[PDB]
DNA sequence: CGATAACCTAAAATTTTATTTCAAAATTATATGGGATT
DNA sequence: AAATCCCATATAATTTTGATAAAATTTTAGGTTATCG
């Protein structure tokens, strides 16, 4: 592995136990190297300046900051493997990316209650999207990621105790089609309770289910949420639906919805509400399914001296 | 850097920008290496099996779990330096200490409200330790570490706004005597409000100050808390004082106080109270001085499904 | 008169804290084309 | 009839997510002194 492409090729073959989406992503970076001048350099000649100039090119190509930072970390790990193989001494990607580029990531603004009520009223009223009203309510009332919602089946709901049992996701990719991913341990499994509006939503979704094709994958069947074609919804299908729905909303409402009103924005709103209401962080972390509690805590506003003093006075 | 001792000696010389307590700690580990068989081995002959046996000896010697794990981290860093200088291949200290030793660290259980009210009652009434009643109230009402308390001077209190300005600590060591450690960035400096009890206790500390000798160090003078000898209290002095206070308490009380009832215990109790009361986690992280929000979240009890459900029901 | 409480402190130990991604794996945007509704 | 949604999906992109010890605190041992047994 003397060329950078060959080195990355060696890295991903050595670390092959990955998911289908990971194989796609690696392919995307491999194409970047093949097109970029950096992929041709021998690894023993790649200097810290070459890696930085690579980033400037990626930004000039039009790739976002988060993309360029993620790919930098892939390359960094690749060169750390060539270091442990006695090919080079220093790792030319061991620099801070913010020193070279500015992070212009557009913040993801959650929905405000006023907007949320407005957004839902439009959905239930609209004759084309009202059929998705139930899914949106469930998203907003549970924090489910989109492929966890798609993976729900009759065996995952418990209406006696009003609990959602989140144990897997249903995914779909080109070629392979549908498949099920689930956690290796029992930590990714969580149980989310249903409030009155979520409980009533699942009831409507089960009563109105119609036209299900014969479908079973990795032992899972009888999914709650189906496309018109009789097969279950996928993340992409909801993404596309949200885009058209938001576009239709902004045409008739003066105040448009945030630019990034996607399915995850429902999870973001759900988490922001609970945090600002002062939910026990460890409890919120359970509902959300976060592994590191740092993830959950990013949803709590930074504290100030006056912030803290108020809290201490509030607690005698 | 052929023997392990010579290697460690190189790791500390190359990384010399350390505080006095670090120099003491490294010296302690150096003694262990010089007394242990492992100190004599050539680094190119230290196998993973060898490092594990070192830990067994340390535990056989009587060193606690955390000590051995801390020292293991030191040795590991030293071998990463040798691996980066092309002296060895793999790091023989890259293993989980859990697999060799069990962690018998006795948990530090904080004071229950009933204990605290009893502990303070005894101090106020005791003819010998009543003079320290004020320092202990402040410890319990502010969460100050012990060397931050010893560092408090008139210029650090603000009785108008009733705020403590923590910006430094006062330390003392054999030979060097006293010195002041401040944070590099203004992130370690924080401000703590005074409750009635605490503000009332600072007034007593200043009215009763007596017998101060001329003393200024790194620009700091007029310290609130002083030994009988006219110089300020140090961490050690409060430690020994706490040790005798607890002994005298456990003689006249049936239910003894926790084994680890030290000055830091007061910081522990303070933090546990606010966490259990449901204080904003990031507001508590500010008051405490924790640099990472993970350190503060350790004081919150893990959540259960029932714990989480009751919280979501509470936030209708 | 002795034992030991109370302070002080050198020496020796334990405990509290410190920067944290050596990319995977998901989600979303978009171009296209064939129906359905303007 | 021209134009615009609505769905579905391949393709391409963005976003979410999962200790490489220093520096403090505390314990203890030995001595003096003051207090108590």
Numbering used by the authors:
A (entry chain B), B (entry chain A): 81 to 396
What do the study authors state?
The Tn1549 conjugative transposon propagates resistance to the antibiotic vancomycin used for severe drug-resistant infections. The DNA cleavage and joining reactions required for CTn transposition are carried out by a transposase enzyme called integrase (Int). Most known CTns, including the Tn916-like family, have Y-transposases that use a conserved tyrosine residue to attack a phosphorous atom in the DNA backbone.
To understand how Int can accommodate different CIs, we determined the structure of two additional Int82N-CI complexes. DNA sequences contained IRL and IRR sites connected by 6 bp homoduplex crossover regions of different sequence (CI6a and CI6b) (Lambertsen et al., 2018). In the Int82N-CI6 complexes, one subunit is shifted with the CAT domains ∼2–3 Å further apart than in the Int82N-CI5 complex, reflecting small flexibility within the dimer. One difference is in the small loop after the β-hairpin, which shows an additional conformation in the CI6 structures located near the DNA crossover region. The maps at the crossover region in the CI6 structures are particularly poorly defined, suggesting that flexibility in this region helps accommodate CIs with different crossover lengths.
